[PDB]
Symmetry: C4
Subunit: 257 residues, 4 copies
């Protein structure tokens, strides 16, 4: 039960525990939010056809160079430097080092920083590279550190795991059912847009969610009846656990007041 005796990490953590307490903490929070937003904007803009063409050493999406002529690389490195500085500052100033991984927002940053170390280690299947370049985008969720609403969203999704699982399960059941029905209904037609049941999965999903795309549509009377049933059942299926998820969100949203 003895005190830590460091007298500096605890002081910094107490100072940065209430960002509204002092001006410098609010300035730092604003700088962090602006840097996150700048990183998001740069990430989105890097994929434009004007810049992407004029950028393994090619499948990784970036080429390391000392000169760093690409402005997008410079901005990415600057944002990575700021993120690393913030992570180290919070890691060296947390009084509860053993329970440092209790905050989810820290796990998000550690997950975002793992791929760089993994790449460095493995440098000395193929879907891993695609999924890792995909997982790069999730520095968006680092906005949950400053946004209270996104924290309420996270708590709602954590407390509504069973209901969301039921939603996914009901959608899956209905999708297979109606895809099978519409594939067999329009099976004896050469103009049919449903070559197979897995292909009809896409139509079943875009009809059950009532999105409606028109890329694949029924053409037979039986196919159209199955499509009508698919739309009705999709409404009836989505509407069941959404109220429970909404009640959870309302609870975690009004819990503050």
């Amino acid at each position: 039960r003895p005190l830590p005796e460091n007298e500096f990490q605890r002081q910094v953590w107490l100072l940065f525990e209430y960002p509204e307490s002092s001006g410098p903490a609010r300035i730092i929070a604003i700088v962090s939010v602006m840097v996150i937003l700048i990183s998001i904007v740069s990430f989105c803009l890097e994929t434009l056809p004007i810049f992407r063409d004029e950028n393994s050493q090619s499948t990784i999406g970036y080429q390391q160079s000392t000169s760093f002529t690409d402005p997008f690389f410079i901005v990415e490195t600057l944002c990575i430097i700021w993120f690393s500085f913030e992570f180290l500052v919070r890691f060296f100033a947390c009084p509860s080092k053993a329970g440092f991984f209790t905050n989810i927002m820290n796990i998000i940053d550690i997950v975002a920083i793992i791929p760089y170390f993994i790449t460095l280690g493995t440098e000395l299947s193929l879907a891993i590279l695609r999924v890792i370049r995909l997982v790069r985008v999730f520095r968006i969720f680092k906005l949950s550190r400053h946004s209270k609403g996104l924290q309420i969203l996270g708590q709602t999704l954590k407390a509504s795991m069973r209901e969301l699982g039921l939603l996914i399960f009901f959608l899956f059941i209905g999708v297979i059912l109606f895809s099978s029905a519409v594939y067999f209904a329009e099976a004896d037609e050469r103009d049919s847009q449903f070559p197979s049941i897995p292909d009809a999965f896409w139509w079943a999903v875009v009809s059950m969610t009532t999105v409606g795309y028109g890329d694949m549509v029924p053409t037979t009377i039986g196919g159209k009846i199955v499509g009508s049933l698919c739309a009705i059942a999709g409404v009836l299926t989505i509407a069941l656990p959404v109220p429970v998820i909404v009640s959870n969100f309302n609870y975690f949203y009004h819990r503050e007041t």
Copy 2:
């Protein structure tokens, strides 16, 4: 209502009354769930153009043979064998089989095994083959034996028969009304995409459910006004009994907790 008096039938009833009794029961349940999922995956994959096209012969979709060279047929036979074994095991314990079929879950399995007897009978008057090949898909509903959420869905649909019937009735009324209106609105146009009122039923259902496909759309001012009314009335009609169905689902969902 005399008791069996055998002194062992009560023991079997007690043993089969508590599925959670032992670990081997959990293992058997897991094996059954995996077998159902494997059967669903195999059934969905059987229809891919890679296997079906590159193997009467088209009306049935499968050829029964003693050799059983097709891997999909092998998996189908294995799953059918497991289902038959489970059904026989659960049926060999019922003294009064006459009232045994009060549960819908056993009717689902007897329906899933109907295709075997139908094929046997027809091996030794056209809709029967297509309907049997389609009813082959309802082995999904045998997942309701293991899933509590799908049981709550079944209870909700049982207790919401009147409200679902009202939904269907209101949808039918609005569909005919607006299909007639949009057919007569765009009747004096040779470029119209509504050849007849039954052909406009498809547009009415995909607009009233607010799915929206674009394959058939109005082109005249009157047709567009009718389409606007169709969308508004479809929202207003779907939204009426969905809250009652949702209340029923919430009741049967919080009853278990």
Copy 3:
């Protein structure tokens, strides 16, 4: 209310007003419902290209002949005869002829029976004919006499006129606003799909109701931003009075039970 006191009209009123009173009344009600359904089916099937082509073919809308070889004409005449018989039978039991225009259910029947007989009478200044040809479809609402659910729908719409009018007003405001915005956003484009604001009304309606057709879509950045705002505002606008209308429907639906 009070009984007629005539001692003979009351018997016929109880016979033709309460189907549950006696078996013959139930049979008559079933016959009436089936006749309405047959009339609806015949009306829908008459417009099919197989039959409509092979029927003053525009001013009257039907060919009168003594032989009446057309099955659709025979069915229409039989249904009209039955409707006229029912209307006369029920009108012979109404003492208050002056207050006959008070019940909306009888006004619906008289309006649905006006077209054919009034056209025949005037056969032996132009919009009236179109109005009559449109109103011929409205015998569907004669099912509200036998269906309690459609009566609850009618009561809900009658008691929710203000909120439904607010819904229409909000949709009109949003439609004009977003159609103007999307027309001016993509005004300086030759490939633009919005020639004018009234032409963009259709897109605004199908986006606000979140139906989504794709026949007319934005192509500019400003047009796409306006479309995003249109979809969001459409959800936010439809969702406001629908709960009130649903509360009214639930009240009038649980009032009977």
Copy 4:
């Protein structure tokens, strides 16, 4: 606050502020509403190719001529004259000019009239003219002075700024997430319809709102999985703060009685 004490401005204020006070006030209110509707109709009709071509008449929005012989320009000037007369009449009824920071009606009016003053100044370099022609559309919101329902809408939007901001934030997060996912999923295809992430923003918005256009759709298995997730998450995200906004609307709707 305190009355002007002039004994004349009060009479005009009561005439032009309380339509229910007297018959002439109701007549004036009806005339104003009809004038706003006529102006809206004329503004919408001005953009039709029938009139706009047969009148730059598009960049400035008006035809400058000494004769001013066009009757439609006369109608527009008459509507502007009536609006100016109403504005002057109500401006002559404000006693305390120093208390400008207390009434929100004066702030709204001054903010709305500043662009009119800029237009007057510039009457006697490209985006300004387009934005002024677009801001001309906001006479639609002048109907809020007479409509109570649109006042309730305004109060609901003013009291639900936090929930609407959360809705926009969640939509933005999901849009960027799923646009990135669908761009990277369908990146290794020559026929891909997602050249870049900002281009996939439109698809993410029209899928998450469940509108569904079909102009740009996924074609790969990964793209289709991402689209399914996009639709589900869009429903789950839109449905969260809409109940709070609806509760606010219901509160401000029933607060009147």
